[PDB]
Enzyme design. Sequence first.
Site, PDB file in Angstrom:
ATOM      1  N   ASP A 199       0.898  -1.193  -0.005  1.00 14.22           N
ATOM      2  CA  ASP A 199      -0.052   0.041  -0.071  1.00 14.22           C
ATOM      3  C   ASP A 199       0.906   1.257  -0.221  1.00 14.22           C
ATOM      4  O   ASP A 199       2.261   1.200  -0.092  1.00 14.22           O
ATOM      5  CB  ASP A 199      -1.073   0.020   1.219  1.00 14.22           C
ATOM      6  CG  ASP A 199      -0.225  -0.393   2.483  1.00 14.22           C
ATOM      7  OD1 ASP A 199       0.621  -1.128   2.349  1.00 14.22           O
ATOM      8  OD2 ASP A 199      -0.704   0.101   3.654  1.00 14.22           O
TER       9      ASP A 199
HETATM   10  C1  LIG Z   1       6.595  12.977  17.688  1.00  6.20           C
HETATM   11  C2  LIG Z   1       5.263  12.905  16.801  1.00  6.20           C
HETATM   12  C3  LIG Z   1       4.382  14.082  17.345  1.00  6.20           C
HETATM   13  C4  LIG Z   1       2.865  13.544  17.295  1.00  6.20           C
HETATM   14  C5  LIG Z   1       2.240  13.200  15.855  1.00  6.20           C
HETATM   15  C6  LIG Z   1       0.761  13.171  15.809  1.00  6.20           C
HETATM   16  C7  LIG Z   1       0.474  12.194  14.500  1.00  6.20           C
HETATM   17  C8  LIG Z   1      -1.000  11.724  14.984  1.00  6.20           C
HETATM   18  C9  LIG Z   1      -1.329  10.286  13.987  1.00  6.20           C
HETATM   19  C10 LIG Z   1      -2.636   9.856  13.862  1.00  6.20           C
HETATM   20  C11 LIG Z   1      -2.866  10.188  12.348  1.00  6.20           C
HETATM   21  C12 LIG Z   1      -4.407   9.824  12.043  1.00  6.20           C
HETATM   22  O1  LIG Z   1      -5.371   9.882  12.700  1.00  6.20           O
HETATM   23  S1  LIG Z   1      -4.734   9.464  10.368  1.00  6.20           S
HETATM   24  C13 LIG Z   1      -5.768  10.670   9.348  1.00  6.20           C
HETATM   25  C14 LIG Z   1      -7.282  10.143   9.572  1.00  6.20           C
HETATM   26  N1  LIG Z   1      -7.777  10.332   8.339  1.00  6.20           N
HETATM   27  C15 LIG Z   1      -7.988   9.395   7.406  1.00  6.20           C
HETATM   28  O2  LIG Z   1      -7.277   8.406   7.707  1.00  6.20           O
HETATM   29  C16 LIG Z   1      -8.889   9.262   6.357  1.00  6.20           C
HETATM   30  C17 LIG Z   1      -8.671   7.960   5.111  1.00  6.20           C
HETATM   31  N2  LIG Z   1      -7.306   8.098   4.583  1.00  6.20           N
HETATM   32  C18 LIG Z   1      -7.149   6.943   3.457  1.00  6.20           C
HETATM   33  O3  LIG Z   1      -7.783   6.185   3.318  1.00  6.20           O
HETATM   34  C19 LIG Z   1      -5.953   7.107   2.766  1.00  6.20           C
HETATM   35  O4  LIG Z   1      -6.006   6.615   1.472  1.00  6.20           O
HETATM   36  C20 LIG Z   1      -4.577   6.228   3.530  1.00  6.20           C
HETATM   37  C21 LIG Z   1      -5.289   5.649   4.943  1.00  6.20           C
HETATM   38  C22 LIG Z   1      -3.538   6.889   3.905  1.00  6.20           C
HETATM   39  C23 LIG Z   1      -4.255   4.962   2.764  1.00  6.20           C
HETATM   40  O5  LIG Z   1      -3.708   5.529   1.472  1.00  6.20           O
HETATM   41  P1  LIG Z   1      -2.916   4.362   0.650  1.00  6.20           P
HETATM   42  O6  LIG Z   1      -3.517   4.138  -0.640  1.00  6.20           O
HETATM   43  O7  LIG Z   1      -1.607   5.162  -0.121  1.00  6.20           O
HETATM   44  O8  LIG Z   1      -2.428   3.205   1.200  1.00  6.20           O
END
Ligand SMILES: CCCCCCCCCCCC(=O)SCCNC(=O)CCNC(=O)[C@H](O)C(C)(C)COP(=O)(O)O
Lengths: 88, 56, 128, 178, 80, 67, 98, 124, 55, 459
Positions: free
Chosen positions: A43
Amino acid sequence: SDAPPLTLEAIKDRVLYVLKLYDKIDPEKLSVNSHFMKDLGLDSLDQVEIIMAMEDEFGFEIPDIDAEKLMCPQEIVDYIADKKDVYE
Amino acid sequence: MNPFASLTLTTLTILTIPIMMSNSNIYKTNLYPNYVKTTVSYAFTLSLVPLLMFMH
Amino acid sequence: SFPKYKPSRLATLPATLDPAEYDISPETRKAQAERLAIRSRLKREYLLQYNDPNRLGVIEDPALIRWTYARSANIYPNFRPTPKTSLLGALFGIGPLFFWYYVFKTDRDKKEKLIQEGKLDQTFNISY
Amino acid sequence: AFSAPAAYLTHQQKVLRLYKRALRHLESWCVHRDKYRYFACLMRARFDEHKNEKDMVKATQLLRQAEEEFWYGQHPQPYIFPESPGGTSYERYECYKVPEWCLDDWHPSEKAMYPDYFAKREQWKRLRRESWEREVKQLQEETPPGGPRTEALPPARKEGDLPPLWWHIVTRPRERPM
Amino acid sequence: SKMELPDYKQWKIEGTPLETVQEKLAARGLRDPWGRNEAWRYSGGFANNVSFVGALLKGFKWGFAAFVVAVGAEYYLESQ
Amino acid sequence: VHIEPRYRQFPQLTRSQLIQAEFFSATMWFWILWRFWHDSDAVLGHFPYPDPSQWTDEELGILPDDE
Amino acid sequence: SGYTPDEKLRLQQLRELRRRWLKDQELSPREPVLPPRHSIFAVTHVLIPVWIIHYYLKYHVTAKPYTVVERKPRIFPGDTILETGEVIPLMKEFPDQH
Amino acid sequence: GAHLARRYLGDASKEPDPLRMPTFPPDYGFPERKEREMVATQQEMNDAQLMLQQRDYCAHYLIQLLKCKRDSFPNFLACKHEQHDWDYCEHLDYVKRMKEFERERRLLQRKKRREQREAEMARG
Amino acid sequence: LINENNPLLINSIKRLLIGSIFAGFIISNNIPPMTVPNTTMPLYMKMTALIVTIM
Amino acid sequence: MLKIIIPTTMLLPMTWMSKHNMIWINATVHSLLISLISLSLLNQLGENSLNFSLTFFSDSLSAPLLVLTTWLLPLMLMASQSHLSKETTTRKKLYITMLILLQLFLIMTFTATELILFYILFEATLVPTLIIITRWGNQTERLNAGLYFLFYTLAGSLPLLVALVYIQNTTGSLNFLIIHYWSHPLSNSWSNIFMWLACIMAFMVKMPLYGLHLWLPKAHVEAPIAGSMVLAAVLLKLGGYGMMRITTILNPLTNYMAYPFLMLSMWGMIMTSSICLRQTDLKSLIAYSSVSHMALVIVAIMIQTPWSFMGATALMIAHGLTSSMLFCLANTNYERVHSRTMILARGLQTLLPLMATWWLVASLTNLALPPSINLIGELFIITASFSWSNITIILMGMNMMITALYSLYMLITTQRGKYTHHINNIKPSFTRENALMALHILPLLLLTLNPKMILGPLY
Ligand SMILES: CCCCCCCCCCCC(=O)SCCNC(=O)CCNC(=O)[C@H](O)C(C)(C)COP(=O)(O)O
Ligand SMILES: CCCCCCCCCCCCCCCCC[C@@H](O)O[C@H](CO[C@H](O)CCCCCCCCCCCCCCC)COP(=O)(O)OCC[N+](C)(C)C
Ligand SMILES: CCCCCCCC/C=C\CCCCCCCC(=O)O[C@H](COC(=O)CCCCCCC/C=C/CCCCCCCC)COP(=O)(O)OCCN
């Protein structure tokens, strides 16, 4: 003196060595023309990790706009060759 | 005349010699850094003497 | 949930933290496409001259000439005597002069009054 | 650097960029490799937990919350590659890069040395000269009447043709010129 | 020059902290697919390393031996 | 001298560098021990700190609160 | 996702041209066509400057007053002066709290 | 520190002020105090070019140390006994200063206590 | 690419190593006394730097 | 003094009777010989001046000015022969005639014994400069700037004449020797106040004083290379020399009337130095640096101490040389890129190493790096001002901090960074340009060994 004159074969060997290390990709089915999505079934988040692994391997950063376009080991090898001005 | 003043002045004046040679045919060769290093080492060796006189 | 980051003049708001990049409507995409079109047309116009083998000299940039002309030669024709302009000019061009005049006149009067009474200890004050 | 930018980044591009940035800052926080591997697998699971979310409103809200989390928890001194824009060797060798046209101003005595190089340079200059009009014509045909929509350039679609606007890309000085 | 890469099959996480990492993810339900790529950081001469106090006392044995032999020589020579 | 990159193996080392490092570390430690044995007073002091309470009132000239 | 066919093809052509140009930046074996004592360092870099400085200080700088001023030598009890032959009396019968 | 804790926290009027000390006459309690003796007069100290800080009641030992250092120059590890003697003299001077401090502290504590007792005996 | 086996680097670092080992003892014993030393100190204050450093 | 005046006049028929391809060579050679002859005036006395005749005299203040004026013409000829290549022979001869007339007028001005002849030549110096600016300038602004140069000066200088002819009606003479020997104090009256103002503002406009300086960024920028060179190097020093001469009769009123001018100068140093920080025009940056430097000379003359006088003379000479070199350096890049924008051409150190070295040395001398004579003059003025008032050290030091800020900035934007890509017409520096740079910079460094030769009559 400084680092040796790295060539095309070296870059290709390093890329395939890094890819073979990865657990997900089967070493036997992997080829230098293998597409990351169609041939190996990875992916996008996995392609990001592969790009980061190559970044760590070669010690230089690939921009995300350039990173997203790379889908074959040959593509990464050619990109690194262009970046490093490697003509053999 | 005691050599203290002469040695102290020579220590500083011999550092300027490679600067005077910056337009000579040593600055365009690859032996210039070694020449400067040798000049600095000689300057240190010369400067060690007035220090000995002071400790005396 | 977390201590909020508030932007300032010298520390602006990041591209990841602005709501404008998370509330998207079709006219926003149209505006972005138009901006890309202008940028691309300018880039092509520059690159046509840049890569030309016959060209020799400097590719003259109208934006730089406009910037210099606005900064130097277009200021007076666009100037109007207004209460804001009048007050700012009077202050910033008059206040420092009389401020420094008062400071130095007071200091010199004090010094001269000390000299006249003969209490300054001006010994060894040969050069002046 | 090499690819033409687009009008915008889609949701997938934004979340992938956030994933890479968060992983890099996590590695900056987790210096050692085993701890970084553990917490990077945890971060990958945290991203995968909403992998197949279909409501774009909730997806955008989660992306916003993740961006706030990243901004609060970012490393004040993240690791930067030495040649990267924030690195310690970013523009170190830009002072040694000399454009090729300077070679045109060399003295005949200077050109007396390296005769083969200057013969090859004359070959390159003639090759550039003989292909300019074809490149201009190709650009004027392929482009829309209004103007280019994207900074992408076309390849050479004929046989004895070179890609338009190639001279400055091909004649880049070096990354380690001296 | 004229030096090739080693075998990619020799990199095992066996006996390394990457194994503790693998169990800690497995107890949570996930896997670490990049553990083997880091294995070379625990394989060869990097397998064992000194501690801080061990680093500070790098050459204590030889210097201490020299010190004791010098003291023993000088003390017995002083008794003229 | 001519050593080569090794790619994920411990780099090649030469005898002279190890013997020089060990020799200089041992020299530093021997210097510390030698100076401690001969110049201990530089660290532990040489004269003891007198306690003011141990000084008699006659030693400091104090009248017995009546004159 | 990925390269478009035109993007990829243009990349191959540019890569071939760049590789050929980089190969053209190489030098021939003849390419730089150039057109047609034991202790001598210490005598021209130390001896000559010190000779000049000693002469200049002894016979030109010293010719004017106060140009080269020396700190007064320290005198301790029991010392003997080389100029007058005077002797300095000893330092007054130490209490000898030994 | 203990003296700092006693002064800044307790009663500041029971212990000496370093700037204003001594406040009592030197012969207030001592029946007979002899003048402190100095060996090296002004002339030898001036000739030896001792600093104004170094010209204290231990100057003679310092002069001997400097003389022996100058005489035995190449072997710089011979001036041990002379350095020991000068350091001992400096230590004795420091103990004398500490003794003066302690004396003034005890005298100041005794004085106020005595006057307060006299006042208490005058309550009625 | 770790390679420190170059005589220039080794000699240059080694000279300053010998300096940083022995220069304090050498210099301190040849300069004349420029001040009055602190002969009398409390034991907990003579050692203050050392306990602060090890802590 | 006629031994220098007559050859200067003879330069005119020599230029007008020379061949179409030999005017520059003859002019340069004979101007260099005239400068060599004028070097003999540096043998000055310690008590009185060199009274050659009833008309001309030389002092320790005017001898370095004369030497600089004579030395400047060969440099102007070298710098002017590049952009006048396509010109016809007659117009080249007219340009050389203008330069020679300017030099002759300047030499006559710096040695006139009488104040009225000094005023006549000091005003006569305007015609060749205005002709040069308004005829051989490049842009359409050269007209307007000329007016700004013509009417700023005259409006200040016309009252001075009315003062001068008045003084002779009360004292009987305008000869400087008689004026100095028979000097009398000035009473504190309104008539004496306006007499003081009339004798001073004429030179304050020329320095220029902050507030009466608007003509300079126009005239210096719009003029050709030689015009700006002579404007910055010599023409600005006329005000300082005239003020030094004429302040003798203004005592003791100068104690009270110098306050507004001192305040204006001490705040204008900061103001112009800060203006130099944000300047899209390099030539304008140099022109504003010139005013920032001349404010110091104004202050030094106003406070009236011997140290201030020596410092002002040294600063005048040093600033003239430095500003001339800086203008030449800017014109070198202008003749390639045909634009005065400071950010248009960057990374020139990669393409022009020796010219980058010349830029570095000129910038170092601009920010008063010791032991250069710029630093000597600035430090003497600062010490005299500190004696005048300690609080001055707040502003002067501030100016220094700003002076290094806009100098190295000018060095960094144009020389450092990466070269601009689209510019590809940068040719290697010609021997003429490098020789001009060297002849500008070598005397500047040589004057350090014998500073007393430019320290004025108070030494
Ligand atoms: C040191 C760090 C500091 C703190 C960092 C904080 C980070 C927060 C982490 C939380 C992140 C989230 O919630 S995640 C963001 C929440 N929203 C979603 O996930 C929407 C749906 N996205 C998709 O479907 C995409 O296609 C995908 C899944 C990428 C697959 O793509 P590929 O087809 O290419 O595999
Ligand atoms: C942008 C820069 C342009 C250049 C600026 C040039 C600066 C010129 C300033 C001249 C200095 C002072 C001029 C006159 C001296 C005193 C001025 C006055 O303020 O002081 C009082 C003067 O008293 C009154 O104030 C009279 C002056 C009132 C009328 C003047 C109008 C002031 C408005 C500001 C004018 C702007 C100047 C620039 C014009 C373009 C002193 O009281 P007094 O003891 O009784 O008089 C002493 C003089 N005596 C002995 C001859 C009698
Ligand atoms: C670029 C702009 C610069 C402007 C500079 C011009 C300002 C110069 C100062 C004013 C000039 C007037 C002085 C002319 C000569 C005076 C000599 C003199 O002493 O005569 C006075 C005469 O003094 C005057 O009459 C002067 C009056 C002013 C007339 C012109 C007005 C001009 C403006 C004056 C105020 C502004 C001055 C400073 C302005 C600064 C510039 C912005 C007395 O003569 P007596 O008849 O003998 O009287 C005594 C016996 N009973």
